[PDB]
Each structure stands twice: as structure tokens, then as C-alpha cells.
Amino acid sequence: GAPATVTEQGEDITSKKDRGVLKIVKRVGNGEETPMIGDKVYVHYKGKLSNGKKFDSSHDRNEPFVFSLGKGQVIKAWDIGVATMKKGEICHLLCKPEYAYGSAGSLPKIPSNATLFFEIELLDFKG
Ligand SMILES: COc1ccc(CC[C@H]2OC(=O)[C@@H]3CCCCN3C(=O)[C@@H](C3CCCCC3)NC(=O)CNC(=O)COc3cccc2c3)cc1OC
């Protein structure tokens, strides 16, 4: 499925070139602008452990999820990954533990050393 395909074929979007954050575009967005560090960004998303059977369903898919890009308000993989998205884009994002919750995890739901998978839709952004 998409997690395996992203693992194998995804683009490495990290500065370190460690394949730690891997991306495949799902739905092509509009224009060429991407959000900038400090912009408010607004998304929809679904996430799971990368080997998980089903996406997590514990948030309201109506409501935009909002954060300030590049400020450490979300896991590192999201600060790197959302920065690459065009408005209206949907992408698949696979994130090794160093770009997610690392050795600590977030117990119980996120174990130690967990690789995560997301689908992210960028709705809008503003400076
Ligand atoms: C700078 O590093 C961090 C910054 C903030 C946190 C707290 C958790 C943070 O969640 C996330 O960053 C990611 C990406 C944005 C959507 C939520 N995230 C999740 O990991 C998912 C998780 C659910 C189970 C399957 C894997 C994906 N969490 C949720 O969907 C539910 N929890 C929340 O959304 C709580 O609210 C947050 C609001 C802002 C940032 C975070 C969480 C953790 C951090 O590092 C470990």
C-alpha cells in the first residue's frame, strides 16, 4: 500500500539526506508558492503507525488543524514536509522516528521507535 510505496519510491525531503522523511504527492496542488517559516498553515490530515491497518480516527476531520510552520509546534517531519506543499496539495508522508517521537514515543498510542505515516491536505496558509 501507500506506506510501502512511499518507503521504496518516495522522495527524500530531508536536509541530511537520510531518507528520514519521504514524500509522494497524492493530489497535485495549485500555483508554485509554498508556506514559509512562521506562516500559519491550515491542513486536514490522517495518520497512523506505518504498519498500521487503519488510519487513526481520534480527531474531527471537519476542523482545520492549524500551526505555525517551522516553529517546532509539530513533529519535525511535518515542519519539513508541509513546507514542500502547494495550496490544495494532498501528499503522503512517511517519517522515521528521529523525525517523529523518537525513543520516548508518546505512550500508549505511539510506541518507542515508531515510524509514522500521514496523508496531509494543505488547505491554506498566511503570513
Ligand atoms: C517539536 O516536536 C513536537 C512537537 C509537538 C508534539 C506533540 C504532538 C503533536 O502531534 C504531531 O506533531 C503530529 C503531526 C500533527 C498532527 C498530529 N500528530 C500526530 O502525531 C497524531 C498521531 C495520532 C496517532 C497516529 C500517528 C499520528 N496525533 C493526533 O492526531 C492526535 N493528537 C493531537 O493532534 C494533539 O494535538 C496536537 C497539536 C499540535 C501538535 C501535536 C499534537 C510532539 C513533538 O515531538 C515529539
Author numbering: 13 to 139
Describing publication, verbatim:
A typical example is the family of FK506‐binding proteins (FKBPs) that possess a highly conserved binding pocket but have diverged to perform diverse biological functions. The larger homolog FKBP51 is a regulator of glucocorticoid receptor (GR) signaling and has emerged as a potential target for depression, obesity‐induced diabetes and chronic pain. The most advanced FKBP51 ligands are compounds of the SAFit class (Selective Antagonists of FKBP51 by induced fit), which bind to a transient binding pocket unavailable to FKBP52 and are up to 10 000‐fold selective for FKBP51 over FKBP52. During a macrocyclization pilot study, we observed that many of these macrocyclic analogs have unanticipated and unprecedented preference for FKBP51 over FKBP12 and FKBP12.6.
The glycine derivative 13 a had an affinity of 2.3 μm, which gradually increased with increasing substitution (13 b (d‐Ala): 1.0 μm, 13 c (Aib): 0.29 μm). The affinity of 13 a and d for FKBP51 was confirmed by isothermal calorimetry (ITC), yielding an enthalpy‐driven K d=3.6 μm ±0.9 μm for 13 a and K d=0.6 μm ±0.1 μm for 13 d, respectively. As intended, the interactions of the pipecolate, the A‐ and B‐rings, as well as the cyclohexyl group with FKBP51 were completely conserved in comparison to previous FKBP51‐SAFit co‐crystal structures. This includes a displacement of F67, which is responsible for the strong selectivity vs. FKBP52 of SAFit‐like ligands. Strikingly, we observed that the carbonyl group of 13 a, 13 d and 13 h displaced D68 and replaced it as a hydrogen bond acceptor for the ϵ‐hydroxy group of Y57. The rearrangement of the β3b strand is stabilized by an inward flip of H71, which partially replaces S70 and substitutes the former as a hydrogen bond donor for the backbone carbonyl of Y57. Intriguingly, H71 is replaced in FKBP12 and FKBP12.6 by an arginine (R40 in FKBP12/12.6 numbering), which can be expected to be less efficient in stabilizing the 13 a‐binding conformation, providing a molecular rationale for the discrimination vs. FKBP12/12.6 observed for the macrocycles. In this particular case, the macrocycles provide the scaffold for the proper positioning of the key carbonyl group that displaces Asp68, which was not possible in the linear analogs.
